[PDB]
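Subject: Re: docking follow-up (zinc ion)

Dear J.,

Thanks for your patience while I sorted out the input files. As discussed at Tuesday's group meeting, I've set up the holo structure prediction with zinc ion included as the bound ligand rather than trying to dock it afterwards. The sequence and the ligand SMILES I used are pasted below, so you can double-check that they match what you have on your end before we go further.
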Amino acid sequence: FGVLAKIVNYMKTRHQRGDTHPLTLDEILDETQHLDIGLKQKQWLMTEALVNNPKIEVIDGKYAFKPKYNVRDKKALLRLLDQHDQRGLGGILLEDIEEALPNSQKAVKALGDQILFVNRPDKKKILFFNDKSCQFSVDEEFQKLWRSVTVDSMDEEKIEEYLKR
Amino acid sequence: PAALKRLAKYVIRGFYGIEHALALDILIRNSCVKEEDMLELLKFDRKQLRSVLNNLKGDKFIKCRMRYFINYRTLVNVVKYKLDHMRRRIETDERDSTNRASFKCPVCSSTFTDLEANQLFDPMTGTFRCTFCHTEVEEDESAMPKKDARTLLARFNEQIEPIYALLRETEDVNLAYEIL
Ligand SMILES: [Zn+2]
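The structure tokens for the complex came back this morning:
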């Protein structure tokens, strides 16, 4: 299993590197320095780790792309967002950076266009999201706003009654 | 009530912050949902999320179903009251706060009125004189925003009135939808 994780980690780094080109098992053994893992483990790999693998990509007669399977478009979820009922997707910042290219470069331009950052995966952690209409009144705003939290203080159907009279 | 969705969005954007607003965006969709599903989608922290929902509950923006198991839904129409209370808030600001006829002693920085002139005056000096600190009183432009500051807030209020006008017009059409 540990050995298999080193295969996963290598593959992870290669995906991160930008490439998803498939390789033979032997090459992967070599590159992971696990060539002498023995016939038995190799066989376990062939008849479980490589075939019972729920998200292994077989292409060009070789095994590729293990870390990811859920997303391949590597672009903003324009389709997901367009919907008025199924809209959404708060996503991890590290997921977006891992998927293809680092967020920060696109983001600096994006920060006043399509992206919003909230501190939420811990205050150090960041989630990416987005916006739409303006603020209502120019003002100090925070001072007026803090005097406007309504009155979530009862007799309020009666405070509108009183207010109407 | 598609326009009502914008007015609600507007109002949330100016008031509450983005930590409230992202959850609020889902609440804007208005659907009965479980806390766990809302937690999975948002990936917020359960504690802060409950803080948000409870603050919203305080606003009465939300209503629930008790199955215990709890489900949350939007009460929608806490909006007419919210608009009205805000107008009173805007109006109270528009009501005068500057005490006119109005002298103050520059030494004690306290305040007195026109009526208190008839008692704080002294004939021996032919001018006014404070009580506990015998000094001449002058003007009033203290703590209460200056004459030129008054103009700046009154204009600001005057600038506030139009920007909420369309919302009232939205409200006017919504109230017509409620006549029917
Ligand atoms: Zn005095």
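A couple of observations from a first look. Chain A has three domains: 1-72, 73-130, 131-165. The two ends of chain A are 76 Å apart (CA to CA).

Let me know if you'd like me to rerun anything.

Best regards,
T.
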